[PDB]
Every structure is written in structure tokens, then in C-alpha cells.
């Protein structure tokens, strides 16, 4: 079989990193660029051991042009529960940053699938979704000051902890906060009765982007659930700059991503060695639901249905397109999931975090519509091979 999760944060850390040409070396590919590509030209993907270098190829790519740089795990790392509260303490070339979460265990012996919410338990997704889960708010604000300023507040801990990573991305320290929970449950593990190979996460609108981040850089979350996540989440540059009025590189925040971005980028997102769609498909081979909501143009779904199926093709060419789902459908307000979109991803959560065997084959189910082929036409079919 293909591994539905892995053991550990990142499983291509020994892979060599890609080439990295200055913004303006950097080739036109005015479609969407090849996931399967090699960054320095030279081939495609061939088995699964390559794919996760083409993994970590895309996570450079984004860490260096747009978000900044990942930490490695720290040094040290000291979790404990005690009175309902998980405390994470994080020590890290003379500096310390500690996460506390109010979680809530399931009764019982286990163990139980996990659920990472942002800023809630569950996130946007109701309570009853996950009555049977470990469930863990990630209080971002503990690591980044969420904040729709196009500012950033230096002073925050992750800064503090690392003070010459104040021109990266705020959802690089929310990614890293995110490890730094799944570190502590580890630790805790058989105090609560986790289930590390079952631990989801999921955030609507900015927390549906910070979920895409966080379970995208982290190979320990079996299921990633961005919910309405719009533009900066799965939502490609490049046909964000195609349609108008969205949330694209001329218009973002540039405290949550690099300023570089637009800098370098505005006006030229045919020169990106990646776009989003590659975003998404570091969750490969695990699995990945996403809800859309057409009804807020903001969202510019169009995009986010063309970078998703792009995306797909990742998981095609392993062959396990059944990992993937969306649903795009309005009717419903933003971040208060349709009727559809709470039975879609039910089947989702069953089977890849409760264990059920429900089918999940072509839930690819969208009220949006757009010339994807027009996207990938170059780059379409390939398939990998599985040993």
C-alpha cells in the first residue's frame, strides 16, 4: 500500500535542496508549473522516495520565495497535562516558547483519533463532528499575533525565539506551532490515549489557510481540512490574477507571507518555480478535503477549484485519488458549513480518521466551474511508481 501518514515531521529532511534561481533568472511558466518537475529542470518524479524530495523541493520553494523558513524541531521539548491542560514547553539555542491547550479527551481506554482545531477545538467544523476525538485548540496567538494590518508585531513569542525569522510569514510560526502540539501529544501519548496515526486538522477562512500550512509541512497529520481557506490558501497566484477582486499577491497581507512575494512576484506569477497547487499537494499521499463557498467572490473559488484539481493530479498519479475530495456550493454563510459539505467531509473524518471503510472515490463535487485542463495541460496523467 502507499503509507496513509508517516512517523515523522518530515520524512524527506535528508533530501538535498533545490535550486533556488534569483526572481528574475527565474523561467516564465505562465500555466501551472509541473508538480512532478525536478526544481532544476532535469525530469520528473519516478517512485515514491522521489516524490518526497519533490515534497521538500516545494516546501523550499515556498519557504524561500513566500513564507520563510520552517525551524527544525528544537532542541528540546517538555510537554505535561495535568487539570484538562496540555503545556508544551520549547527550548531552542538559549530561548524558550511555551503552548498551552485546553484539550478534552474522549472516556475510555483508546486510543482516540486526534483533532487540531484553530483557535477552538474543531475549529469550524461543529463539536458533534468529533464527539469521539482528542480534541486540541491551537492558540495561535501564542506563537504569532493574528491581525489583519498588513503589520507585523515582532514582539510575539515565536519572534522573540527567533529573531532573525522577522521578515518570514506569520503561518510559518503558526505551521511551526502546530508541530510544536503534535510534539507534545506525542510526548503525552499514552497519558490521554492518543492515536498518532489519526490526528486531523482543520481552520476556516484565515484558520482554513493556517490548516492548509499546517498539515501540508507536517507528515503526521492523516487528514488536512481547510475550510473556505480562499485566497493564500489553496487558491492558485496565478488564475487569482486571472479573475478579479480576489485576494491575490497585488492585494494580501504582507506580515502572513513575505513581503518578497510581492516584490519580486507582482504582475510576474508566471515567473513561480510552484504555485499553490503544489501547496496542496505536499499533503500527498495523505489525505485531503477542502470546502469551498462560491456565494463571497473574495474567496475566488474559481482559482481554488482550478489550483484543487491540480493538485489531484498528484494523488492520480499514486494512485489514491480517493484521499482527495472537495466541495465547492454555496447557500450557506462563510465558514458555517452547507448540509452537502458536513456529509462530504463526514465521510472524510470516517475513513481516514475514525477508520471506518467508507468509500471516498470521486467526491469531487463543485457548483464552480472553470477550464482546469486550460491549467495542466502540459503536465497531465503521469503516474508514480508505488515499488
Given at each position: 500500500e502507499v503509507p496513509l501518514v508517516y512517523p515523522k515531521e518530515n520524512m524527506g529532511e535528508s533530501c538535498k535542496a533545490p535550486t533556488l534561481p534569483q526572481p528574475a533568472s527565474c523561467?516564465?511558466?505562465?500555466?501551472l508549473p509541473d508538480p512532478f518537475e525536478w526544481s532544476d529542470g532535469s525530469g520528473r518524479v519516478k517512485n515514491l522516495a522521489d516524490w518526497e524530495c519533490r515534497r521538500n523541493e516545494i516546501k523550499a520553494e515556498i519557504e524561500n520565495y513566500e513564507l520563510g523558513?520552517?525551524?527544525?524541531?528544537?532542541?528540546?521539548?517538555?510537554?505535561?497535562?495535568?487539570?484538562?491542560?496540555l503545556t508544551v514547553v520549547v527550548?531552542?539555542?538559549?530561548?524558550?516558547?511555551?503552548?498551552?491547550?485546553k484539550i478534552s479527551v474522549p472516556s475510555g481506554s483508546g486510543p482516540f483519533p486526534v483533532?487540531?482545531?484553530m483557535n477552538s477545538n474543531t475549529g469550524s467544523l461543529s463539536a458533534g463532528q468529533f464527539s469521539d476525538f482528542i480534541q486540541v485548540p491551537f492558540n495561535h496567538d501564542q506563537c504569532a499575533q493574528y491581525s489583519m494590518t498588513g503589520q507585523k508585531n515582532t514582539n510575539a513569542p515565536f519572534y522573540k525565539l527567533y529573531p532573525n525569522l522577522r521578515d518570514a510569514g506569520d503561518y510559518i510560526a503558526w505551521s511551526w506551532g502546530i508541530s510544536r502540539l503534535i510534539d507534545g501529544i506525542e510526548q503525552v501519548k499514552d497519558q490521554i490515549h492518543a492515536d498518532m496515526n489519526h490526528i486531523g486538522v482543520t481552520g476556516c477562512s484565515y484558520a482554513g489557510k493556517m490548516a492548509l500550512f499546517g498539515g501540508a509541512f507536517?507528515?503526521?497529520?492523516?487528514?488536512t481540512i481547510p475550510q473556505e481557506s480562499g485566497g493564500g490558501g489553496i487558491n492558485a497566484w496565478?488564475?487569482?490574477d486571472t479573475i478579479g477582486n480576489v485576494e491575490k499577491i497585488d492585494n494580501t497581507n504582507y506580515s502572513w507571507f513575505?513581503?518578497?512575494?510581492?516584490?519580486?512576484?507582482?504582475?510576474?506569477?508566471?515567473?513561480?518555480?510552484?504555485?499553490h497547487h503544489e501547496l496542496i499537494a505536499m499533503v500527498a499521499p495523505r489525505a485531503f478535503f477542502t470546502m469551498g463557498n462560491p456565494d463571497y467572490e473574495w474567496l475566488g473559488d474559481k482559482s481554488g477549484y482550478t489550483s484543487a484539481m491540480a493538485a489531484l493530479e498528484v494523488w492520480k498519479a499514486m494512485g489514491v485519488?480517493?484521499?482527495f475530495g472537495f466541495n465547492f456550493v454555496g447557500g450557506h454563510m462563510h465558514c458555517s458549513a452547507a448540509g452537502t459539505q458536513v456529509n462530504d467531509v463526514n465521510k472524510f473524518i470516517d475513513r481516514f480518521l475514525r477508520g471506518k471503510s467508507v468509500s471516498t472515490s470521486n467526491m469531487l463535487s463543485s457548483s464552480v466551474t472553470n477550464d482546469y485542463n486550460s491549467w495542466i495541460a502540459a503536465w497531465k496523467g503521469y503516474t508514480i511508481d508505488t515499488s
Open positions: 523561467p516564465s511558466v505562465p500555466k523558513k520552517k525551524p527544525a524541531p528544537p532542541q528540546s521539548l517538555k510537554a505535561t497535562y495535568s487539570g484538562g491542560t527550548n531552542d539555542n538559549g530561548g524558550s516558547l511555551t503552548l498551552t491547550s483533532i487540531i482545531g507536517d507528515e503526521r497529520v492523516a487528514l496565478r488564475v487569482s513575505m513581503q518578497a512575494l510581492k516584490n519580486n512576484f507582482n504582475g510576474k506569477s508566471d515567473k513561480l518555480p510552484y504555485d485519488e480517493d484521499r
